[PDB]
Amino acid sequence: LADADAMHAKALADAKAESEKVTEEAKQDSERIAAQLSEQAGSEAERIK
Amino acid sequence: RAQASGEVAQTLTQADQQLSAQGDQVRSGLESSVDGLSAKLASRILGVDV
């Protein structure tokens, strides 16, 4: 029971760490997708000009 | 896209105005040119100058 409680604590800690890592990776993604879409917007605007 | 479309529409309107004025001036000049152009065209059609 002590080992299982420690396993649950470790699982929660690792879940927090993994969620933080996933959020950081997703923020970097969101940034890159936003940059790509902004470049596409510029290309479309210049084509129309 | 909307900003570029609006800018393009404004440029088209400004052209339709200024270029229309330019065309009016060029038409004024062509009005003087008509006499000589027609005279030479008739001369070529008939032959023997005139």
Cβ-Cβ contacts under 8 Å for B42 (sequence gap 6 or more): B50
Cβ-Cβ contacts under 8 Å for B1 (sequence gap 6 or more): A41, A44, A45, A48
Rg of chain A, C-alpha, whole Å: 21
Residue A43 to residue A33: CA distance in whole angstroms:
15
Give yes or no for A4 touching B (CB within 8 A): no
Structure tokens at B46: 């008939």
- Quote the minimal CA–CA distance from B3 to chain A in Å: 8
Nearest to A49 by CA among B28, B22, B27, B12: B12
Give yes or no for A39 touching B (CB within 8 A): no
Q: What angle do CA B16, B21, B25 make, to 5 degrees?
A: 145
This PDB structure is determined at a resolution in Å of 2.8
Evaluate whether B50 touches B42 at the Cβ level (below 8 Å).
Answer: yes
Evaluate whether B4 touches A44 at the Cβ level (below 8 Å).
Answer: yes
- Long-range contacts for A24-32 (Cβ within 8 Å, ≥24 apart)? none
